[PDB]
Tab-separated table of all heavy atoms in Angstrom:
chain	number	residue	atom	x	y	z
A	139	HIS	N	0.761	-1.166	0.026
A	139	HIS	CA	-0.020	0.081	-0.004
A	139	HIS	C	0.789	1.314	-0.007
A	139	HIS	O	2.062	1.271	0.343
A	139	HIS	CB	-1.010	-0.049	1.083
A	139	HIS	CG	-1.944	-1.253	1.081
A	139	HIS	ND1	-3.250	-1.078	0.606
A	139	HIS	CD2	-1.683	-2.474	1.485
A	139	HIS	CE1	-3.754	-2.262	0.760
A	139	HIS	NE2	-2.892	-3.119	1.221
A	140	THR	N	0.225	2.422	-0.425
A	140	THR	CA	0.868	3.660	-0.320
A	140	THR	C	0.230	4.750	0.535
A	140	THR	O	-1.082	4.620	0.628
A	140	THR	CB	0.916	4.342	-1.813
A	140	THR	OG1	1.134	3.300	-2.815
A	140	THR	CG2	1.982	5.563	-1.721
A	141	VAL	N	1.028	5.595	1.103
A	141	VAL	CA	0.401	6.686	1.663
A	141	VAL	C	1.115	7.985	1.193
A	141	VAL	O	2.371	7.861	1.134
A	141	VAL	CB	0.355	6.496	3.284
A	141	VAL	CG1	1.798	6.589	3.769
A	141	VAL	CG2	-0.518	7.508	3.797
A	142	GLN	N	0.326	8.923	0.803
A	142	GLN	CA	0.842	10.056	0.266
A	142	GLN	C	0.319	11.283	0.951
A	142	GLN	O	-0.861	11.433	1.283
A	142	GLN	CB	0.547	10.232	-1.244
A	142	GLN	CG	1.441	9.368	-2.119
A	142	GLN	CD	0.632	9.148	-3.544
A	142	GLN	OE1	0.087	8.133	-3.727
A	142	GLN	NE2	0.868	10.159	-4.436
A	143	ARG	N	1.188	12.389	1.036
A	143	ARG	CA	0.681	13.688	1.689
A	143	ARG	C	1.579	14.881	1.140
A	143	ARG	O	2.639	15.056	1.707
A	143	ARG	CB	0.850	13.676	3.125
A	143	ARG	CG	0.745	15.003	3.821
A	143	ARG	CD	1.726	15.004	5.137
A	143	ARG	NE	1.514	13.913	5.982
A	143	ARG	CZ	0.721	13.929	7.055
A	143	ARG	NH1	-0.047	15.041	7.399
A	143	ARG	NH2	0.691	12.815	7.917
A	144	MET	N	0.905	15.823	0.464
A	144	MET	CA	1.710	17.042	0.111
A	144	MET	C	1.093	18.150	0.884
A	144	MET	O	0.062	18.313	1.224
A	144	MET	CB	1.401	17.376	-1.253
A	144	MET	CG	0.018	17.393	-1.585
A	144	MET	SD	0.270	18.506	-3.003
A	144	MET	CE	0.587	20.070	-2.118
A	145	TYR	N	2.116	19.232	1.155
A	145	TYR	CA	1.636	20.444	1.784
A	145	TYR	C	2.558	21.625	1.346
A	145	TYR	O	3.689	21.359	0.819
A	145	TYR	CB	1.494	20.344	3.323
A	145	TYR	CG	2.760	20.105	4.024
A	145	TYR	CD1	3.617	21.075	4.242
A	145	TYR	CD2	2.958	18.847	4.635
A	145	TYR	CE1	4.936	20.801	4.912
A	145	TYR	CE2	4.148	18.633	5.324
A	145	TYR	CZ	5.042	19.568	5.470
A	145	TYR	OH	6.268	19.281	6.170
A	146	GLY	N	2.132	22.789	1.552
A	146	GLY	CA	2.955	24.041	1.194
A	146	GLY	C	2.056	25.381	1.101
A	146	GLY	O	0.908	25.313	1.423
A	147	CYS	N	2.764	26.400	0.626
A	147	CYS	CA	2.054	27.637	0.779
A	147	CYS	C	2.357	28.582	-0.516
A	147	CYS	O	3.393	28.518	-1.122
A	147	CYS	CB	2.514	28.449	1.890
A	147	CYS	SG	4.377	28.497	2.029
A	148	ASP	N	1.345	29.332	-0.884
A	148	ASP	CA	1.505	30.287	-2.030
A	148	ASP	C	1.686	31.727	-1.714
A	148	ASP	O	1.143	32.208	-0.770
A	148	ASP	CB	0.313	30.179	-3.065
A	148	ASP	CG	0.368	29.022	-3.872
A	148	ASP	OD1	1.521	28.417	-3.963
A	148	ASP	OD2	-0.618	28.464	-4.373
A	149	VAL	N	2.434	32.423	-2.503
A	149	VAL	CA	2.561	33.938	-2.380
A	149	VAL	C	2.568	34.582	-3.701
A	149	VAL	O	2.842	34.007	-4.783
A	149	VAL	CB	3.989	34.268	-1.483
A	149	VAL	CG1	3.869	33.885	-0.177
A	149	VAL	CG2	5.171	33.728	-2.284
A	150	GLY	N	2.218	35.886	-3.686
A	150	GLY	CA	2.275	36.739	-4.973
A	150	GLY	C	3.395	37.499	-5.185
A	150	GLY	O	4.344	37.377	-4.614
A	151	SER	N	3.273	38.481	-6.084
A	151	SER	CA	4.376	39.297	-6.641
A	151	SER	C	5.053	40.137	-5.505
A	151	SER	O	6.351	40.036	-5.311
A	151	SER	CB	3.862	40.275	-7.669
A	151	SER	OG	4.866	41.035	-8.281
A	152	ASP	N	4.178	40.781	-4.658
A	152	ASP	CA	4.682	41.374	-3.373
A	152	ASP	C	5.187	40.333	-2.309
A	152	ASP	O	5.783	40.777	-1.357
A	152	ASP	CB	3.374	42.096	-2.804
A	152	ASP	CG	2.341	41.089	-2.404
A	152	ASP	OD1	2.671	39.949	-1.820
A	152	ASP	OD2	1.178	41.360	-2.725
A	153	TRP	N	4.906	39.052	-2.510
A	153	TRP	CA	5.318	37.994	-1.568
A	153	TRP	C	4.519	37.701	-0.186
A	153	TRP	O	4.982	37.289	0.719
A	153	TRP	CB	6.933	38.058	-1.226
A	153	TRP	CG	7.760	37.996	-2.361
A	153	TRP	CD1	7.395	37.840	-3.668
A	153	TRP	CD2	9.159	38.019	-2.275
A	153	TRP	NE1	8.538	37.662	-4.459
A	153	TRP	CE2	9.706	37.889	-3.667
A	153	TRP	CE3	10.188	38.232	-1.271
A	153	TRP	CZ2	11.022	37.892	-3.972
A	153	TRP	CZ3	11.504	38.229	-1.593
A	153	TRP	CH2	11.845	38.049	-2.979
A	154	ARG	N	3.330	38.303	-0.411
A	154	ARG	CA	2.305	38.186	0.632
A	154	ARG	C	1.737	36.868	0.632
A	154	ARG	O	1.863	36.104	-0.293
A	154	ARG	CB	1.189	39.251	0.456
A	154	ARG	CG	1.405	40.639	1.168
A	154	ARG	CD	0.129	41.359	1.104
A	154	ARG	NE	-0.140	41.696	-0.407
A	154	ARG	CZ	-1.257	41.110	-1.147
A	154	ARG	NH1	-2.033	40.234	-0.498
A	154	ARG	NH2	-1.353	41.493	-2.407
A	155	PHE	N	1.002	36.517	1.708
A	155	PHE	CA	0.250	35.258	1.755
A	155	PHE	C	-0.883	35.148	0.692
A	155	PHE	O	-1.664	36.113	0.563
A	155	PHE	CB	-0.148	34.963	3.165
A	155	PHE	CG	-0.709	33.511	3.199
A	155	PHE	CD1	0.196	32.493	3.252
A	155	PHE	CD2	-2.032	33.289	3.317
A	155	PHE	CE1	-0.205	31.152	3.222
A	155	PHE	CE2	-2.544	31.995	3.517
A	155	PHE	CZ	-1.627	30.928	3.413
A	156	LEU	N	-0.960	34.103	0.137
A	156	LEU	CA	-2.061	33.748	-0.795
A	156	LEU	C	-2.973	32.629	-0.466
A	156	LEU	O	-4.083	32.800	0.099
A	156	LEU	CB	-1.464	33.472	-2.240
A	156	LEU	CG	-1.026	34.675	-2.967
A	156	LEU	CD1	-0.451	34.239	-4.302
A	156	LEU	CD2	-2.147	35.705	-3.099
A	157	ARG	N	-2.537	31.320	-0.614
A	157	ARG	CA	-3.350	30.209	-0.191
A	157	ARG	C	-2.393	29.190	0.541
A	157	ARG	O	-1.220	29.058	0.338
A	157	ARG	CB	-3.958	29.422	-1.316
A	157	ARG	CG	-5.023	30.386	-1.873
A	157	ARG	CD	-5.763	29.725	-2.993
A	157	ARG	NE	-6.806	30.714	-3.584
A	157	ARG	CZ	-8.018	30.951	-3.051
A	157	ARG	NH1	-8.370	30.307	-1.920
A	157	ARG	NH2	-8.730	31.850	-3.654
A	158	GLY	N	-3.042	28.376	1.391
A	158	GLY	CA	-2.246	27.269	1.986
A	158	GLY	C	-3.018	26.037	1.755
A	158	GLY	O	-4.192	26.013	1.462
A	159	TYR	N	-2.363	24.908	1.845
A	159	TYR	CA	-2.929	23.659	1.524
A	159	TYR	C	-2.120	22.471	2.293
A	159	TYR	O	-0.948	22.646	2.642
A	159	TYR	CB	-3.102	23.233	0.046
A	159	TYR	CG	-1.845	23.734	-0.716
A	159	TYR	CD1	-0.631	23.234	-0.483
A	159	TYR	CD2	-2.075	24.769	-1.701
A	159	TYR	CE1	0.461	23.680	-1.263
A	159	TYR	CE2	-0.925	25.321	-2.375
A	159	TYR	CZ	0.309	24.710	-2.205
A	159	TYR	OH	1.373	25.181	-2.960
A	160	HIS	N	-2.828	21.483	2.571
A	160	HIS	CA	-2.332	20.166	3.164
A	160	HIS	C	-3.276	19.115	2.763
A	160	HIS	O	-4.489	19.229	3.033
A	160	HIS	CB	-2.310	20.374	4.742
A	160	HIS	CG	-1.799	19.081	5.355
A	160	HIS	ND1	-0.528	18.912	5.840
A	160	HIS	CD2	-2.452	17.966	5.722
A	160	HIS	CE1	-0.412	17.818	6.343
A	160	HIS	NE2	-1.537	17.125	6.324
A	161	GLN	N	-2.716	18.093	2.152
A	161	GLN	CA	-3.550	16.978	1.529
A	161	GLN	C	-2.948	15.630	1.729
A	161	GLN	O	-1.771	15.454	1.676
A	161	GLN	CB	-3.818	17.223	0.069
A	161	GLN	CG	-4.821	18.353	-0.320
A	161	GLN	CD	-4.622	18.843	-1.655
A	161	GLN	OE1	-3.955	19.782	-1.895
A	161	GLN	NE2	-5.142	18.098	-2.705
A	162	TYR	N	-3.799	14.620	1.980
A	162	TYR	CA	-3.464	13.312	2.317
A	162	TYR	C	-4.196	12.183	1.530
A	162	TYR	O	-5.419	12.290	1.422
A	162	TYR	CB	-3.644	13.108	3.870
A	162	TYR	CG	-2.835	12.004	4.481
A	162	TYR	CD1	-1.602	12.217	4.985
A	162	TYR	CD2	-3.352	10.748	4.482
A	162	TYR	CE1	-0.880	11.158	5.677
A	162	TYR	CE2	-2.702	9.677	5.104
A	162	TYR	CZ	-1.492	9.965	5.661
A	162	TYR	OH	-0.839	8.885	6.369
A	163	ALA	N	-3.429	11.291	0.938
A	163	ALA	CA	-3.957	10.125	0.264
A	163	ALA	C	-3.513	8.794	0.754
A	163	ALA	O	-2.517	8.579	1.231
A	163	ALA	CB	-3.620	10.155	-1.225
A	164	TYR	N	-4.566	7.765	0.492
A	164	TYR	CA	-4.221	6.399	0.822
A	164	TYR	C	-4.380	5.548	-0.504
A	164	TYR	O	-5.518	5.639	-1.068
A	164	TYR	CB	-5.030	5.871	1.966
A	164	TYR	CG	-4.673	4.328	2.415
A	164	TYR	CD1	-3.401	3.985	2.402
A	164	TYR	CD2	-5.675	3.404	2.505
A	164	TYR	CE1	-2.957	2.579	2.664
A	164	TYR	CE2	-5.389	2.067	2.731
A	164	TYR	CZ	-4.028	1.720	2.883
A	164	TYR	OH	-3.780	0.413	3.153
A	165	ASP	N	-3.468	4.871	-0.846
A	165	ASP	CA	-3.580	4.048	-2.242
A	165	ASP	C	-4.218	4.977	-3.348
A	165	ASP	O	-5.071	4.454	-3.960
A	165	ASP	CB	-4.375	2.815	-2.108
A	165	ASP	CG	-3.729	1.781	-1.173
A	165	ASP	OD1	-2.403	1.655	-1.298
A	165	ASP	OD2	-4.398	0.966	-0.474
A	166	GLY	N	-3.719	6.174	-3.598
A	166	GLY	CA	-3.938	6.966	-4.685
A	166	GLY	C	-5.224	7.642	-4.605
A	166	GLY	O	-5.424	8.567	-5.434
A	167	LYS	N	-5.987	7.427	-3.567
A	167	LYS	CA	-7.308	8.085	-3.426
A	167	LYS	C	-7.354	9.159	-2.263
A	167	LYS	O	-6.693	9.012	-1.287
A	167	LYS	CB	-8.459	6.943	-3.089
A	167	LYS	CG	-8.183	6.094	-1.971
A	167	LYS	CD	-9.411	5.656	-1.111
A	167	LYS	CE	-9.025	4.862	0.169
A	167	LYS	NZ	-8.066	3.661	0.084
A	168	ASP	N	-8.104	10.249	-2.594
A	168	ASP	CA	-8.412	11.284	-1.463
A	168	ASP	C	-8.758	10.743	-0.165
A	168	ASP	O	-9.616	9.912	-0.092
A	168	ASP	CB	-9.440	12.301	-1.946
A	168	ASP	CG	-8.993	13.379	-2.994
A	168	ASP	OD1	-7.800	13.516	-3.196
A	168	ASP	OD2	-9.919	14.018	-3.463
A	169	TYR	N	-8.063	11.116	1.001
A	169	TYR	CA	-8.400	10.600	2.255
A	169	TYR	C	-8.798	11.528	3.169
A	169	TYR	O	-9.906	11.420	3.887
A	169	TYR	CB	-7.092	9.817	2.918
A	169	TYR	CG	-7.462	9.153	4.167
A	169	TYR	CD1	-8.110	7.981	4.284
A	169	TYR	CD2	-7.086	9.713	5.414
A	169	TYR	CE1	-8.424	7.416	5.460
A	169	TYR	CE2	-7.238	9.200	6.615
A	169	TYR	CZ	-7.915	7.949	6.672
A	169	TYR	OH	-8.227	7.391	7.896
A	170	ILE	N	-8.149	12.624	3.405
A	170	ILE	CA	-8.466	13.857	4.175
A	170	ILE	C	-7.711	15.084	3.750
A	170	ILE	O	-6.559	15.083	3.331
A	170	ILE	CB	-8.353	13.515	5.806
A	170	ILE	CG1	-8.899	14.629	6.607
A	170	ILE	CG2	-6.828	13.144	6.137
A	170	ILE	CD1	-8.900	14.357	8.033
A	171	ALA	N	-8.376	16.234	3.742
A	171	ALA	CA	-7.744	17.402	3.341
A	171	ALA	C	-8.118	18.637	4.255
A	171	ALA	O	-9.243	18.736	4.724
A	171	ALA	CB	-8.188	17.727	1.866
A	172	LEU	N	-7.216	19.567	4.196
A	172	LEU	CA	-7.554	20.743	4.875
A	172	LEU	C	-8.469	21.494	4.017
A	172	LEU	O	-8.497	21.188	2.862
A	172	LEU	CB	-6.144	21.550	5.349
A	172	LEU	CG	-6.129	22.489	6.476
A	172	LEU	CD1	-6.495	21.665	7.752
A	172	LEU	CD2	-4.776	23.144	6.880
A	173	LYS	N	-9.279	22.305	4.575
A	173	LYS	CA	-10.045	23.166	3.626
A	173	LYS	C	-9.135	24.426	3.441
A	173	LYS	O	-8.109	24.532	3.985
A	173	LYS	CB	-11.418	23.536	4.297
A	173	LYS	CG	-12.489	22.371	3.932
A	173	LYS	CD	-13.734	22.793	4.478
A	173	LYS	CE	-14.707	21.473	4.593
A	173	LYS	NZ	-15.747	21.752	5.676
A	174	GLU	N	-9.620	25.385	2.631
A	174	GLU	CA	-8.865	26.586	2.280
A	174	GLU	C	-8.744	27.486	3.371
A	174	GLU	O	-7.750	28.230	3.482
A	174	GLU	CB	-9.365	27.186	0.911
A	174	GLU	CG	-10.636	28.021	1.066
A	174	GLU	CD	-11.337	28.195	-0.244
A	174	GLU	OE1	-11.512	27.284	-1.067
A	174	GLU	OE2	-11.824	29.422	-0.493
A	175	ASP	N	-9.848	27.501	4.113
A	175	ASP	CA	-9.861	28.364	5.388
A	175	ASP	C	-8.490	28.030	6.377
A	175	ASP	O	-8.060	28.945	7.071
A	175	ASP	CB	-11.225	28.461	6.008
A	175	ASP	CG	-11.738	27.115	6.548
A	175	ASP	OD1	-10.984	26.139	6.441
A	175	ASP	OD2	-12.865	27.099	7.005
């Protein structure tokens, strides 16, 4: 089996905060994710 999880943050031209994310998968399928809030 596989477990996968990516995370990170976006910034714009000024380098201010844009969006954040955190996402987790089991065997290739969506398992649990942060919302955009």
Side-chain angles (χ1 to χ4, degrees):
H139 303 259
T140 320
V141 70
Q142 278 162 265
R143 160 218 311 267
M144 58 152 281
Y145 65 72
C147 48
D148 284 338
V149 291
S151 182
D152 64 43
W153 300 357
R154 267 190 297 108
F155 188 67
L156 286 176
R157 294 183 181 277
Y159 36 66
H160 177 97
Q161 286 160 263
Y162 198 97
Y164 184 47
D165 292 326
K167 61 148 187 299
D168 280 346
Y169 182 79
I170 188 174
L172 206 55
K173 277 181 199 155
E174 71 197 46
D175 66 1

